[PDB]
Symmetry: C4
């Protein structure tokens, strides 16, 4: 955190140079009661790289001012003292990586781009004020006029209240018209890309659901089941934000996928009265094999007397347990609990009727994987007997 404070100090240093250097090139009446901050900030820029694509620090290192002021270089040649301002590309690419995951990275790119567009419109406005006719005017009313002019130019508005006069003004205006049109086109392109990728789980997710509403409106379905389907999609949004568990953690390797599934279902694979005291690898295998299913409120998951193969573990929702006639209530289950256990070791029919109560988010276990990783574990085969 002392290099985070160092990055903050370096950003303040390069900001100071970005605000000062074009202001003392236009106004050479400055820089004289402000050289000490030039010395301190230059030492900061030359001492940052030991505490950290290479020529920005080297070009920022050399004293490109003080030469203008001791040798009185003319107007088109003094301007190379802005070479220190190439360092801002390096500080940009560093600040775009030092804090790239506390917040969204696209909002980071948009704020860095808006910063660069204002800070280059500043330099272009500074160039315009440099090649202006000399006249008495407050350097504020000449910042407001230069900035007003270069926004009239950058925003493709065009009042025409201030126009080029000399040919070398007309050439400077032509060239900054091309760069202004390029930069403003870049601004429109980056904003349309930043707002194109601004909603991802809710956009694609919505599209998916939508792809199913204009269809279920195509089949002319009754509105009760269609609203129930829509409330299903509302549930899976308002629980996992549209994302599928097995397609988020399919872009991971096997050890990392194992660690993520154990961390996600840690006190879940422990919710059970069944996997406690089991082996560590066994738990991983189980997780590497947990399958989620979702029952809406009131759905029949299991009817007592069916064939039945697989065991069910409740994770999030509730459920109720009914007898074979679905008249006598055995119990009512909730998250963390489990049913279908009398189907794995035995080819018996269902012993209780299982109606959903709310949306469930419940895990199921297939028979082949369970009896494969149960034959080799004796202690859970006794935990289940």
């Amino acid at each position: 955190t002392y290099t985070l404070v160092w990055k903050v100090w370096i950003l303040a240093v390069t900001l100071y140079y970005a605000i000062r250097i074009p202001l003392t090139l236009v106004f050479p009446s400055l820089f004289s009661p402000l050289l000490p901050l030039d010395i301190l900030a230059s030492l900061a820029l030359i001492a940052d790289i030991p505490l950290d694509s290479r020529l920005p620090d080297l070009l920022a290192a050399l004293p490109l001012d003080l030469l203008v002021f001791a040798l009185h270089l003319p107007s088109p040649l003094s301007l190379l003292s802005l070479v220190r301002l190439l360092k801002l590309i390096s500080v940009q690419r560093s600040a775009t990586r030092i804090l790239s995951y506390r917040i969204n990275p696209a909002l980071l790119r948009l704020l860095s781009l808006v910063g660069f567009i204002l800070l280059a419109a500043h330099g272009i406005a500074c160039g315009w004020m440099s090649l202006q006719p000399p006249s008495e005017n407050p350097a504020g009313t000449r910042y407001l006029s230069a900035f007003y002019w270069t926004i009239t130019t950058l925003t493709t508005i065009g009042y025409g209240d201030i126009t080029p006069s000399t040919p070398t003004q007309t050439v400077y205006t032509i060239v900054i018209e091309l760069l202004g049109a390029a930069m403003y086109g870049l601004v429109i392109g980056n904003i349309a890309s930043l707002v194109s990728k601004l909603d991802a789980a809710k956009l694609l997710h919505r599209e998916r659901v939508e792809r199913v509403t204009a269809f279920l409106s195509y089949k002319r379905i009754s509105p009760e089941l269609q609203r129930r389907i829509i409330e299903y999609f509302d549930y899976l949004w308002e629980t996992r934000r549209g994302y599928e568990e097995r397609e988020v953690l399919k872009e991971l390797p096997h050890p990392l996928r194992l660690a993520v599934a154990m961390e996600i279902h840690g006190d879940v694979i422990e919710k059970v009265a069944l996997f406690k005291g089991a082996g560590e690898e066994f738990i991983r295998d189980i997780i590497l094999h947990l399958e989620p299913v979702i029952y809406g409120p009131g759905e029949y998951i299991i009817r007592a007397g069916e064939m039945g193969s697989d065991v069910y573990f409740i994770n999030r929702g509730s459920v109720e347990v009914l007898s074979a006639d679905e008249k006598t209530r055995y119990a009512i289950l909730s998250e963390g609990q489990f049913f279908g256990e009398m189907a794995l070791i035995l080819r018996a029919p269902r012993t209780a009727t299982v109606r959903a109560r709310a949306f469930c988010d419940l895990y199921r276990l297939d028979k082949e994987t369970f009896d494969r990783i149960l034959s080799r574990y004796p202690e859970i085969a006794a935990q289940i007997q």
Copy 2:
């Protein structure tokens, strides 16, 4: 439907405030013969949330006007009485969800965005009329001039007939030039996204078919078969709008996929003289196993004397039945009917020649799935004997 009328009442209330508040900030000669609608609408905004991301109703609740009018707050400080207008973000996000599936959701987003762009251009025009030089002018000719100015600014047109005069006008014009350029760029980006996703089944579908026309034009094929292929693609558009049945209902879970297939093929799985009186689960299994195939008009589906494995159920088109010499016509089948039934229980060759008549949309049944879910059903094994 009394909360749909409540949402309509709340939208009318927030619209009234959105039209009134900036009109009484600019013209303080109003609000005096119109306070009663302020009281009624404020009670509506403070009583809506009990009949329903939280600070909009709280900021809308407090009397931010009446303070301007009793204490005569100055021009840059009275303007905080527009804080009630942050409620419109909440009403926007509520009205974008209460009626999101009667119509397309993208047309909904486009209408909400156009509404927000006009209603913010209204506020910016109101700000311009606020910081204008005071002069005698009808408040209509000052709405037409303020709205004409702020559309000249928002539409990057730029006549230059009305320009800033004071420096604080030039700063206000600069800042609303940046916001106008941002909002107009946002308008172009959202319109290009709304018309990019405006045609989906006909765009992607067309592309797919196209990907096959520039290819079949690449192989230099005769036009008769290529037109027949194109009329095939015309048929599958003009029947199911390009969508594949099994990739629309593959984004559903198993119980929902079962319910949708039973609802789609309900009086289809009943069209048969074969699945009536069958089991409920059996029907589901059958559906969970129905496979669609499409024969164009005149195609040979079955020639009598072939080997033959699988049974065919007609769903939509017609077909004709010919004898083994394809000389003596047995019958002619239509939708709902079926052929190939003398191939599942027996390894006999075809008993009739089956020529298509129109485009068919016909269902077929593989042998392994059929004999697997037929061995365990005795009554359909007698229905088929």
Copy 3:
């Protein structure tokens, strides 16, 4: 082809109305020596639909002019005689389908959109000329001025040389500023979509290859093999335009896929001295089982003395045949010919060394499919013995 001439006649009729109706609404001095073409074109529009989403022909049918001219309807009410011009939407959707595959359909959409944008800018310019102050001016210099104005407006340029004067001009200018901004945004969105999907096999294909050049540049590979790989990608472009045979004809049904593969490899499955005299279905099965492989110039496909399983059929390139010591040349094969035939019936090792000569595009046959569809064909088992 007499309905193609009818569509051409109808397009000429609706074009004539689209050029005439707004020209006689602005200039009522016309229409009097030109009623006969109105009668003929109206009969054409009312007789087209018998030789062919329904209300365009009905609204085009009724005499909405002649009422303006006999009853002298005022300026805001006469304008409903433009209702005939809604027919152009129907003619657009008909002409966008009658010739949708002689040329690309996207170039068709772009030309129809540019046509609609000019033809609506014509109507808006006509509206501007309608609500102009009456003054003496040639109707050409008033078309050039109205069209110049409405392009200055539609192209977000904004000279400001002609501006609204009356309030009802300012409202008309405001409303056509909103529509002009909407239409010009639509133009930018459709052009960016038309040029986004303009290159498909060469864009995606290039990307695929590229995804392999920045990688093979990542592994720091020697340039000879990388250039050979790139010339491989150049070959598969400059032969089949990037498209994979089995992913173009995987979006087809089985009978259509069989017909396309037989048509593609017709005198290919006949190139052989092996499938001639074979069964018709057998040929289809063979095709339904032909597998393409591509050997670059000089590659070793088979070395004599290897194990060898599968037979190879040359389709496009050349190859050479060497002895087991790769010293004595047996022969040299070309397209249409075949090797590896002494590996299917027998588990013998290679009998000749097969070096590629150019890029090959050669077909191979696996052993299980070949011996499965060879056991049931006796005549080819003798053709191969």
Copy 4:
């Protein structure tokens, strides 16, 4: 490299014509002390095609000037001497292919498009200067004014300081307004496509990882494992730039995939004390079967006493070797080395505990492939005994 110098000479020749021909059409006072470069450059254009979609060289070949100057052709008919400038399309499509892989091809398309947009804005400006009123003005102040005008037009800015005057100027301005709007829309579309495809491995890769951060932020995971996962994604970026080895070289054919894998893992498949002296084909088979796995720093790959099946070859990272009690350190392995060798020939349990040390990038070998291609190699079965 003498045809690379020939392409450079031809580009210089066609550039000279592209700068000269519209300059001598506007100013006919030129061309007289500059005919020799016309003769030399015309000979270069007519002699290029022997040292190299056909009509550009033929249209460039004929003397379309000298006719203007000997017969004094009038203003709308002399202009066909610009027909030589169609050759630039051929030189464009040639220069877009002669150096398409030293640098990115998209940067090439962007530079060619910017070149074509400036070089056509030059011709349109030349047309404007052609149809101007004749007046005394330096041909520089008339290039700055014509170029300033045609950028005011091309950039949708619109000062309105110079406007059409005659009707044939208004028609020329209208037509170049349509082309300017089309070209500027094309510029915005190509820039948004060039910056849309500008980041591919880092964009898609980032998205993939992101698709896993907003999810692992969804499961509310502890930050230590999530940061470790993120540093995993940082490692696989900062090693292979996001690309998967087996999906880069899956778009290759089998001989090319074999050559690339042997070139990538050449002194890798030789790093081993195991595949040296093995067969050439065997090595290829091994490579055609090498599988990469990645262990983070500190992960347990193998615990001594586990079952164990497969052998591991270290490629990049480090690892350490521990005894069965994980108390006594056997050794510590690094890249190029290998473990798990006492699991292939034997069904013994692990003999040493293998903890990762850094991120590994290590290769593993499954048992079935290894014992399949080991049964048929006797010498490596002795190298491993």
